[PDB]
Each structure stands twice: as C-alpha cells, then as structure tokens.
Amino acid sequence: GSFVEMVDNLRGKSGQGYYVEMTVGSPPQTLNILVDTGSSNFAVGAAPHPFLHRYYQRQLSSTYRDLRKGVYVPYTQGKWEGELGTDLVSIPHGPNVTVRANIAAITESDKFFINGSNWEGILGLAYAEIARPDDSLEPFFDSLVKQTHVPNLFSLQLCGALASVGGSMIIGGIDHSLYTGSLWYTPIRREWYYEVIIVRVEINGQDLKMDCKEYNYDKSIVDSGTTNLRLPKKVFEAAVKSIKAASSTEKFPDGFWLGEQLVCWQAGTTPWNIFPVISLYLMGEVTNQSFRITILPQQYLRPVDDCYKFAISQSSTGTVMGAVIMEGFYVVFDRARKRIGFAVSACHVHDEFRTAAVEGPFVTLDMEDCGYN
Ligand SMILES: NC1=N[C@@]2(c3ccc(F)cc3F)CO[C@@H](CF)C[C@H]2CS1
C-alpha cells in the first residue's frame, strides 16, 4: 500500500543503469549495486579495479564464509569471474531485515564495470534456472523470501531524467502513489528470465500484421539491466518501415534508425508530434483476453541544440523490454502469483497532447500460439 522509506531509493546516470544502496558483511560495508531483472547472480567487485569507488573487502568481515567454488560468467558484451561465498546482506532503504546470501566476489572482468559509473556490483533479480554456475546457487530474492516474512513480490518505478536518473524499488509490496489508473497483469510464461508473450504490435494504432510468433522469437523478457527496447530482426525491420512512414514530414539518414548517427533540433523545438506512439499487446490473465501498453517518442528517442539517439534496436535473443519500456510504467514483479503487472507511471515523461497508456480488455484469439517452442 504505502512504503515511504523505499520511495526514491534508486539512483544512476543516463545509460549507466539504476543502482540501490546495499550493505555486505560484519561490520557493514556500503556498496552501490545495479538492479538487474535480466540475470540471477549477486556479484560485487572485490578487488581495486581503477573504475571502482569502493569494493567488497572479505578480510574485514567476521560473518564471511568461503564456499571454495569459482564462477565464470562470459556474456555477449563482456565477462566477469569470481569466488563464491556467503555473508550478511541488508538494504538500508528497504525492509528492516538482514539475510545470509550467496555473493560472487568479482576477481577478474572485461567490459563489465563502467568508467565513470557510481556502482560496484550487480543484483540479479531473475530465477535460479539462469544462475551461474547452475540452479543450485540460490539468488538473493529467493534467500530474502525464505529467511524473512517479506512477501514474494517487488515492484519497479524507473523515472529516467550526464543527467542523473532516479526511481523506486519497492521490496515486498506495491506503493499506490507511484501509479495512476489500474494495474493489468501478464502471466510469467516460465520462471527463468521474467518471460512474457506479446500478442500484437501497433505503430500509431496501425497493426504490424506479422505472425505473432515473430514477436516472441526466441523469447520476450522484461529487463531493467537493458537500456533499449530490443526487437527480433524481422519485427525491427517492419516497425522501422512503419515508424519512417508515420514520421515522413521530416527526413532522417538511414544510419539514425540503426543507432549509428544522432538527430538534432534547436533547443526546446523537438517535434514530438511527428513521431508515432508504439503499442505492445500482452497476453492477459483470462483466455482470449489481452491488454495493451503504449509508449511515446519521449521514451524511445533518448537524449545524448537538443540531440537524440533512436533507442529501439534489433536483437538475436528475442524481445527485450528494457528502460525504453520500463520508464513509461510502474512494473509489479508478482512472483507469488507468477505474473507481471503494468500501470501508467506517475513519473513518466509526456506532453500536453499524449501520455503513456495501459488499456484493456481486448479480445485476442490463439494467444498461446504466439509463444516460441
Ligand atoms: N540484463 C543484462 N545483464 C548483464 C549486465 C547488465 C548491466 C551491466 F552494466 C552489466 C551487465 F553485465 C549481466 O548479466 C549478464 C548475463 F549473465 C548479461 C549482461 C548484459 S544484459
């Protein structure tokens, strides 16, 4: 209902992620930790990397326990590796609890830490199935729910704005002040990533008319650790062709659509009106029932004279609903009921003509056929 102490507990810089303050060990060691719904490991810098403001010093903790196991995490854009162990963890601007959690002490990395950022670790909030080295390594939120009376739910309000960013991570609840209108739920298809099903796509109310399996090839996920709205290659081509057609009053280079170049207008003269709204229809809670979420160019044209980057991009890992999607909405990760809720965010960026929207119910048949196998 109301969680005043957790409101505004997220900070960051544009394109550098959202972080929360955490404490590790005894006596407590304060660290800034990136909130990531796209991964499942709690991993912190444990060595004096030059980009880091601070790091986990295991030698100073009386509650530190060594698991005597390594962890190696290569991924597409980089890699991190470390040493597994446990320790006492708390969230100063969160629930009044202390938990014994798995912690990967980062001992080597490449393109993981950001030069100029104010975070030193990552909080993977997804499920055990995608945890490294395997699903036997219990993620943080699972340890939290198991050892305390904290309800199995968390919500995110990412507000956006190198300009400073803010938001709220409500642990174990929902804060009704952070959204307007009603919450609409989409089922979590499978507990690994926060996997969802997109059943329809519209550009200014105009349907893309693609086989809905294309929207979810090979999956659709909700990821706070990603900036862009990432679309499968075939869907991106069709969406761009439709966005270019809708905004044809002004012509832009082909490189802009691919994120290779920026577009500039004289300060305070950005023509938001010429850019279309983008709607994603999501699988509802009832058979043949869907709802839709709508974003504005204020969410997908990102500030870098006012210059902008097109923050919709092509993907080979499926649909990624990153910060572009999440900044328009209050997102409820209702783990207890295996569903994700969306509502219009009380902090989303809009104008006097259009606002972000969450609407329903809509009749959509064969929604289960939209999922990739
Ligand atoms: N959702 C993602 N999280 C990862 C990530 C996110 C932000 C960041 F600053 C650094 C990262 F490494 C961590 O988990 C990797 C998977 F293990 C994937 C990457 C990229 S996308």
Short mmCIF file of C-alpha atoms and ligand atoms in Angstrom, two decimals:
data_model
loop_
_atom_site.label_atom_id
_atom_site.label_comp_id
_atom_site.label_asym_id
_atom_site.label_seq_id
_atom_site.Cartn_x
_atom_site.Cartn_y
_atom_site.Cartn_z
CA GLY A 1 0.00 0.00 0.00
CA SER A 2 2.49 2.65 1.27
CA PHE A 3 6.32 2.29 1.64
CA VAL A 4 7.68 5.90 2.18
CA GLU A 5 11.16 4.65 3.27
CA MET A 6 11.64 2.77 -0.09
CA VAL A 7 10.40 5.64 -2.39
CA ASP A 8 13.36 7.24 -4.34
CA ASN A 9 15.88 4.54 -3.26
CA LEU A 10 17.26 4.24 -6.85
CA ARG A 11 19.91 6.48 -8.47
CA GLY A 12 22.13 6.47 -11.55
CA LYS A 13 23.27 8.20 -14.73
CA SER A 14 21.72 8.03 -18.22
CA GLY A 15 22.74 4.78 -19.97
CA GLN A 16 24.73 3.59 -16.85
CA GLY A 17 21.84 1.65 -15.15
CA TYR A 18 19.87 2.04 -11.90
CA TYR A 19 21.54 1.17 -8.57
CA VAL A 20 20.38 0.65 -4.97
CA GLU A 21 22.45 1.04 -1.77
CA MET A 22 23.28 -2.31 -0.07
CA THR A 23 25.39 -3.37 2.93
CA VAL A 24 27.55 -6.52 2.97
CA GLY A 25 29.37 -8.18 5.90
CA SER A 26 30.03 -7.52 9.59
CA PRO A 27 30.71 -4.61 10.33
CA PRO A 28 28.60 -3.44 7.27
CA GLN A 29 30.30 -2.41 4.00
CA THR A 30 28.25 0.05 1.93
CA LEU A 31 28.09 -0.59 -1.84
CA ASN A 32 26.07 0.74 -4.82
CA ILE A 33 24.54 -2.20 -6.70
CA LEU A 34 22.94 -2.29 -10.20
CA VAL A 35 19.29 -3.61 -10.19
CA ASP A 36 19.08 -6.28 -12.95
CA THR A 37 15.87 -8.25 -13.72
CA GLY A 38 17.73 -9.91 -16.65
CA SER A 39 20.17 -12.03 -14.60
CA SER A 40 20.22 -14.05 -11.33
CA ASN A 41 23.59 -13.51 -9.55
CA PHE A 42 24.53 -11.22 -6.68
CA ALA A 43 28.10 -10.25 -7.79
CA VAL A 44 30.27 -7.46 -6.33
CA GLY A 45 33.73 -6.05 -7.11
CA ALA A 46 36.21 -7.48 -4.54
CA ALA A 47 39.49 -6.06 -5.96
CA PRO A 48 40.85 -2.49 -6.56
CA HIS A 49 39.77 -2.10 -10.22
CA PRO A 50 40.56 1.58 -11.20
CA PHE A 51 36.90 2.31 -12.24
CA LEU A 52 35.60 1.41 -8.74
CA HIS A 53 34.81 3.89 -5.91
CA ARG A 54 34.78 1.02 -3.41
CA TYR A 55 34.78 -2.77 -3.29
CA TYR A 56 34.00 -5.77 -1.03
CA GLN A 57 36.92 -6.49 1.38
CA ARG A 58 36.26 -10.09 2.63
CA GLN A 59 39.20 -9.90 5.14
CA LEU A 60 37.21 -7.27 7.20
CA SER A 61 34.06 -9.38 7.57
CA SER A 62 33.59 -11.71 10.57
CA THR A 63 30.44 -13.26 9.02
CA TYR A 64 32.12 -14.07 5.66
CA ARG A 65 32.04 -17.81 4.69
CA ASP A 66 34.01 -19.29 1.78
CA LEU A 67 32.16 -21.75 -0.50
CA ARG A 68 35.53 -22.74 -2.15
CA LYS A 69 33.98 -22.58 -5.65
CA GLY A 70 34.71 -20.45 -8.72
CA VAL A 71 32.19 -18.84 -11.12
CA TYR A 72 32.84 -17.79 -14.75
CA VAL A 73 30.30 -15.56 -16.49
CA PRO A 74 31.04 -14.66 -20.15
CA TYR A 75 28.16 -12.93 -21.97
CA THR A 76 27.69 -11.09 -25.33
CA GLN A 77 29.11 -7.65 -24.40
CA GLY A 78 31.68 -8.85 -21.78
CA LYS A 79 32.72 -11.13 -18.89
CA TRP A 80 33.10 -11.36 -15.10
CA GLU A 81 34.50 -14.10 -12.91
CA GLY A 82 34.93 -14.67 -9.21
CA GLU A 83 34.90 -16.62 -5.96
CA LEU A 84 31.67 -17.84 -4.33
CA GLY A 85 30.87 -17.29 -0.65
CA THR A 86 28.14 -16.13 1.78
CA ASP A 87 27.66 -13.14 4.00
CA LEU A 88 25.10 -10.98 5.83
CA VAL A 89 23.32 -8.54 3.48
CA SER A 90 20.93 -5.66 4.14
CA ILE A 91 19.23 -2.85 2.10
CA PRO A 92 19.35 0.48 4.10
CA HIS A 93 16.37 1.99 2.14
CA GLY A 94 14.39 -1.27 2.05
CA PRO A 95 12.92 -3.81 4.53
CA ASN A 96 14.35 -3.80 8.12
CA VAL A 97 15.95 -7.30 7.64
CA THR A 98 19.40 -9.00 7.31
CA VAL A 99 19.87 -12.14 5.18
CA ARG A 100 22.63 -14.69 4.55
CA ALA A 101 23.06 -14.58 0.79
CA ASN A 102 25.31 -16.06 -1.88
CA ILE A 103 27.86 -13.46 -3.08
CA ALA A 104 30.25 -13.79 -6.03
CA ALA A 105 33.40 -11.76 -5.21
CA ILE A 106 34.48 -10.39 -8.67
CA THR A 107 38.20 -11.04 -9.14
CA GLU A 108 38.54 -10.50 -12.94
CA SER A 109 36.39 -8.73 -15.55
CA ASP A 110 36.28 -7.34 -19.08
CA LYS A 111 33.84 -4.57 -20.24
CA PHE A 112 31.65 -5.18 -17.11
CA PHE A 113 32.42 -2.14 -14.89
CA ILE A 114 31.73 1.28 -16.47
CA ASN A 115 34.38 4.07 -16.48
CA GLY A 116 32.60 6.97 -14.73
CA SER A 117 29.77 4.99 -13.08
CA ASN A 118 28.87 5.03 -9.35
CA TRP A 119 28.09 1.25 -8.87
CA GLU A 120 30.45 -1.66 -7.92
CA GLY A 121 28.16 -4.69 -8.19
CA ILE A 122 25.01 -6.25 -9.66
CA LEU A 123 21.83 -7.66 -8.08
CA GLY A 124 20.41 -10.34 -10.40
CA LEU A 125 16.66 -10.45 -9.60
CA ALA A 126 15.61 -13.24 -12.09
CA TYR A 127 15.20 -17.01 -11.25
CA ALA A 128 17.65 -19.83 -10.23
CA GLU A 129 17.37 -21.51 -13.71
CA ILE A 130 19.74 -18.87 -15.29
CA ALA A 131 22.03 -18.51 -12.19
CA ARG A 132 25.77 -19.24 -12.74
CA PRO A 133 27.39 -21.82 -12.30
CA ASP A 134 23.96 -23.60 -12.03
CA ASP A 135 20.40 -23.50 -10.50
CA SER A 136 21.72 -24.83 -7.12
CA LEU A 137 23.13 -21.29 -6.40
CA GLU A 138 20.18 -19.60 -4.63
CA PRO A 139 19.55 -15.98 -5.91
CA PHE A 140 19.25 -13.07 -3.42
CA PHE A 141 15.43 -12.55 -3.57
CA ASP A 142 14.81 -16.32 -3.02
CA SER A 143 17.08 -16.15 0.13
CA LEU A 144 15.22 -12.99 1.26
CA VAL A 145 11.71 -14.62 0.99
CA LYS A 146 12.94 -17.92 2.64
CA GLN A 147 14.61 -16.28 5.72
CA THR A 148 12.11 -13.43 6.41
CA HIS A 149 8.36 -12.56 6.30
CA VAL A 150 9.00 -10.27 3.22
CA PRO A 151 6.23 -11.10 0.65
CA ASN A 152 7.37 -12.75 -2.64
CA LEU A 153 6.92 -9.60 -4.78
CA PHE A 154 8.88 -6.46 -5.75
CA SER A 155 7.97 -3.52 -7.93
CA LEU A 156 9.94 -1.01 -10.03
CA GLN A 157 9.37 2.64 -10.90
CA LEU A 158 12.26 3.75 -13.21
CA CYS A 159 11.88 7.53 -13.75
CA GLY A 160 14.77 8.44 -16.07
CA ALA A 161 15.87 12.11 -16.17
CA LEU A 162 25.41 13.05 -17.97
CA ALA A 163 21.98 13.73 -16.38
CA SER A 164 21.02 11.93 -13.11
CA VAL A 165 18.25 9.31 -13.02
CA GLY A 166 16.03 8.19 -10.12
CA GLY A 167 13.34 5.69 -9.24
CA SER A 168 11.95 3.29 -6.63
CA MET A 169 12.41 -0.38 -5.88
CA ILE A 170 9.56 -1.46 -3.58
CA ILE A 171 10.64 -4.73 -1.90
CA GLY A 172 7.77 -6.97 -0.71
CA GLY A 173 4.97 -4.69 -1.87
CA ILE A 174 3.25 -2.15 -4.11
CA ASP A 175 3.14 1.63 -3.47
CA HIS A 176 -0.17 3.04 -4.89
CA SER A 177 1.25 6.63 -5.04
CA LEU A 178 3.70 5.57 -7.85
CA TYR A 179 0.98 4.84 -10.49
CA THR A 180 -2.33 6.13 -11.92
CA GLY A 181 -5.27 4.05 -13.20
CA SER A 182 -5.36 0.28 -12.82
CA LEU A 183 -2.72 -2.50 -12.87
CA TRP A 184 -3.07 -5.04 -15.76
CA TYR A 185 -1.30 -8.39 -15.41
CA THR A 186 0.54 -10.60 -17.88
CA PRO A 187 1.48 -14.18 -16.90
CA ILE A 188 5.13 -15.15 -16.47
CA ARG A 189 5.42 -17.88 -19.13
CA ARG A 190 8.29 -19.69 -17.38
CA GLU A 191 10.43 -18.88 -14.29
CA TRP A 192 13.99 -18.28 -15.67
CA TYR A 193 14.11 -14.73 -17.09
CA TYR A 194 10.88 -12.74 -16.49
CA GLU A 195 9.40 -14.27 -19.71
CA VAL A 196 6.21 -12.78 -21.26
CA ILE A 197 4.14 -13.13 -24.51
CA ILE A 198 3.47 -10.20 -26.94
CA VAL A 199 0.32 -10.99 -28.95
CA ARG A 200 0.08 -7.83 -31.16
CA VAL A 201 2.16 -4.75 -32.20
CA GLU A 202 0.77 -1.39 -33.41
CA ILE A 203 2.53 1.83 -34.62
CA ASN A 204 0.03 4.75 -34.15
CA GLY A 205 -2.85 2.19 -33.95
CA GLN A 206 -1.69 0.53 -37.21
CA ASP A 207 -1.20 -3.23 -36.77
CA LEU A 208 2.14 -4.72 -37.99
CA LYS A 209 0.09 -7.82 -39.16
CA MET A 210 3.00 -10.26 -38.59
CA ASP A 211 2.65 -13.86 -37.32
CA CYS A 212 2.65 -13.22 -33.51
CA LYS A 213 5.32 -15.99 -33.12
CA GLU A 214 7.81 -13.45 -34.68
CA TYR A 215 7.24 -11.05 -31.71
CA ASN A 216 8.47 -13.73 -29.29
CA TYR A 217 11.30 -15.31 -31.37
CA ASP A 218 13.01 -16.86 -29.36
CA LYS A 219 11.60 -15.20 -26.16
CA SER A 220 10.21 -11.87 -24.79
CA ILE A 221 11.58 -10.69 -21.43
CA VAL A 222 11.30 -7.72 -19.00
CA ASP A 223 14.89 -6.45 -18.29
CA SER A 224 15.89 -3.45 -16.08
CA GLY A 225 19.59 -4.09 -16.93
CA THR A 226 18.99 -3.13 -20.64
CA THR A 227 18.52 0.44 -21.96
CA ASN A 228 16.78 -0.15 -25.30
CA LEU A 229 13.59 -1.72 -26.50
CA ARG A 230 15.18 -4.65 -28.35
CA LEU A 231 13.11 -6.36 -31.14
CA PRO A 232 13.75 -9.59 -33.17
CA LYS A 233 15.38 -8.67 -36.57
CA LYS A 234 12.23 -9.31 -38.74
CA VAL A 235 9.99 -7.29 -36.31
CA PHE A 236 12.50 -4.40 -36.09
CA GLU A 237 12.56 -4.12 -39.96
CA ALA A 238 8.71 -3.92 -40.12
CA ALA A 239 8.46 -1.50 -37.10
CA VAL A 240 11.14 0.89 -38.57
CA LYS A 241 9.46 0.80 -42.06
CA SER A 242 6.18 1.84 -40.29
CA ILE A 243 7.85 4.47 -37.93
CA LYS A 244 9.69 6.04 -41.01
CA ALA A 245 6.37 6.16 -42.94
CA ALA A 246 4.47 7.79 -39.97
CA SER A 247 7.17 10.49 -39.40
CA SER A 248 7.82 11.22 -43.17
CA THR A 249 7.16 15.07 -42.75
CA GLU A 250 10.90 15.21 -41.79
CA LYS A 251 13.61 13.06 -43.46
CA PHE A 252 16.44 11.42 -41.45
CA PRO A 253 19.60 9.45 -42.52
CA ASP A 254 19.36 5.59 -42.67
CA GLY A 255 22.15 5.47 -40.02
CA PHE A 256 19.86 7.11 -37.39
CA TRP A 257 17.39 4.14 -37.45
CA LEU A 258 20.37 1.76 -36.91
CA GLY A 259 21.74 3.86 -33.98
CA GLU A 260 24.88 4.86 -35.99
CA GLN A 261 24.09 8.63 -36.03
CA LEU A 262 22.15 11.17 -33.90
CA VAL A 263 19.43 13.69 -34.92
CA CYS A 264 19.46 17.33 -33.64
CA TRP A 265 16.94 20.18 -33.35
CA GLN A 266 17.33 23.72 -31.88
CA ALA A 267 16.90 23.62 -28.04
CA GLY A 268 13.24 23.23 -26.98
CA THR A 269 11.94 22.74 -30.58
CA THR A 270 11.86 18.83 -30.70
CA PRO A 271 8.86 17.82 -32.93
CA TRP A 272 7.43 15.04 -30.65
CA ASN A 273 4.07 15.32 -32.58
CA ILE A 274 5.61 13.95 -35.84
CA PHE A 275 6.73 10.69 -34.09
CA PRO A 276 4.18 7.85 -33.58
CA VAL A 277 3.09 6.05 -30.39
CA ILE A 278 4.15 2.34 -30.08
CA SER A 279 1.74 -0.26 -28.64
CA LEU A 280 2.51 -3.73 -27.35
CA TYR A 281 -0.43 -6.06 -26.66
CA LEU A 282 0.35 -8.51 -23.89
CA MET A 283 -1.27 -11.88 -23.03
CA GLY A 284 -3.90 -11.26 -20.31
CA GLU A 285 -4.96 -13.31 -17.27
CA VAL A 286 -8.08 -14.85 -18.97
CA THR A 287 -8.43 -16.95 -22.19
CA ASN A 288 -8.88 -14.80 -25.36
CA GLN A 289 -8.20 -11.63 -23.25
CA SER A 290 -5.32 -9.16 -23.78
CA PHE A 291 -4.36 -5.59 -22.77
CA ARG A 292 -2.04 -3.07 -24.35
CA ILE A 293 0.84 -0.84 -23.22
CA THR A 294 1.63 2.38 -25.18
CA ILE A 295 4.91 4.37 -25.21
CA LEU A 296 5.69 7.84 -26.63
CA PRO A 297 8.81 9.06 -28.58
CA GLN A 298 9.76 10.70 -25.19
CA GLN A 299 10.60 7.07 -24.11
CA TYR A 300 12.19 5.73 -27.37
CA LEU A 301 14.12 8.88 -28.58
CA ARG A 302 16.86 9.20 -25.93
CA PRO A 303 18.75 12.47 -25.16
CA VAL A 304 22.53 12.23 -25.82
CA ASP A 305 20.87 22.13 -29.64
CA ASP A 306 18.93 19.01 -28.48
CA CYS A 307 20.41 15.75 -29.89
CA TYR A 308 18.78 12.28 -29.67
CA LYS A 309 19.52 8.57 -30.26
CA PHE A 310 16.90 6.08 -31.60
CA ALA A 311 16.68 3.62 -28.67
CA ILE A 312 14.82 0.81 -30.50
CA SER A 313 17.27 -1.82 -31.84
CA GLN A 314 17.46 -5.26 -33.50
CA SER A 315 18.08 -8.39 -31.42
CA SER A 316 19.07 -12.05 -31.95
CA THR A 317 17.99 -13.07 -28.38
CA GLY A 318 14.29 -12.05 -28.74
CA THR A 319 12.26 -9.11 -27.43
CA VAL A 320 13.96 -7.20 -24.62
CA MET A 321 11.65 -4.75 -22.78
CA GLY A 322 14.40 -2.51 -21.31
CA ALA A 323 14.41 1.01 -19.80
CA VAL A 324 12.62 2.35 -23.00
CA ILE A 325 9.51 0.30 -21.96
CA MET A 326 10.02 0.36 -18.13
CA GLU A 327 10.26 4.23 -17.90
CA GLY A 328 6.63 4.63 -19.03
CA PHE A 329 5.28 2.23 -16.37
CA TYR A 330 5.15 1.06 -12.78
CA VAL A 331 6.12 -2.62 -13.10
CA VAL A 332 4.97 -5.23 -10.49
CA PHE A 333 7.01 -8.47 -10.44
CA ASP A 334 4.38 -10.64 -8.68
CA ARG A 335 6.47 -13.81 -8.19
CA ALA A 336 3.87 -15.36 -5.75
CA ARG A 337 1.19 -15.29 -8.49
CA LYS A 338 3.58 -15.95 -11.49
CA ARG A 339 2.56 -12.66 -13.20
CA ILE A 340 3.83 -9.18 -14.13
CA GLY A 341 1.68 -6.07 -13.64
CA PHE A 342 1.80 -2.82 -15.65
CA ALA A 343 0.25 0.55 -14.77
CA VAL A 344 0.85 4.14 -16.00
CA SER A 345 3.83 5.56 -14.02
CA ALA A 346 3.15 8.80 -12.02
CA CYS A 347 6.73 9.95 -13.10
CA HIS A 348 6.76 9.11 -16.92
CA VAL A 349 7.83 11.85 -19.39
CA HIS A 350 4.95 13.13 -21.61
CA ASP A 351 3.49 16.33 -23.22
CA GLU A 352 0.14 18.23 -23.22
CA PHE A 353 -1.22 16.05 -26.12
CA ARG A 354 -0.18 12.42 -25.36
CA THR A 355 0.65 10.26 -22.28
CA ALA A 356 1.88 6.63 -21.82
CA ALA A 357 -1.08 4.23 -21.52
CA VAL A 358 -2.22 0.81 -20.16
CA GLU A 359 -5.62 -0.22 -21.58
CA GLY A 360 -8.00 -3.19 -21.70
CA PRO A 361 -9.65 -5.60 -22.07
CA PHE A 362 -9.19 -6.55 -25.75
CA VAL A 363 -10.32 -9.76 -27.48
CA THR A 364 -7.31 -11.65 -28.96
CA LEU A 365 -7.59 -15.27 -30.14
CA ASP A 366 -4.84 -18.01 -30.24
CA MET A 367 -2.54 -16.11 -27.79
CA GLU A 368 -0.80 -19.40 -26.76
CA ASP A 369 0.30 -19.92 -30.44
CA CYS A 370 2.36 -16.62 -30.08
CA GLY A 371 4.89 -18.38 -27.77
CA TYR A 372 8.07 -19.88 -29.31
CA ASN A 373 8.95 -23.58 -28.73
N1 LIG B 1 20.46 -7.83 -18.31
C1 LIG B 1 21.82 -7.88 -18.52
N2 LIG B 1 22.62 -8.09 -17.51
C2 LIG B 1 24.08 -8.05 -17.64
C3 LIG B 1 24.61 -6.65 -17.39
C4 LIG B 1 23.74 -5.57 -17.23
C5 LIG B 1 24.20 -4.28 -16.98
C6 LIG B 1 25.58 -4.07 -16.85
F1 LIG B 1 26.03 -2.85 -16.60
C7 LIG B 1 26.49 -5.11 -16.99
C8 LIG B 1 25.98 -6.39 -17.27
F2 LIG B 1 26.88 -7.35 -17.42
C9 LIG B 1 24.55 -9.02 -16.51
O1 LIG B 1 24.20 -10.34 -16.78
C10 LIG B 1 24.75 -10.84 -17.98
C11 LIG B 1 24.27 -12.31 -18.05
F3 LIG B 1 24.87 -13.04 -17.08
C12 LIG B 1 24.22 -10.05 -19.18
C13 LIG B 1 24.58 -8.57 -19.01
C14 LIG B 1 24.05 -7.72 -20.15
S1 LIG B 1 22.24 -7.63 -20.23
#
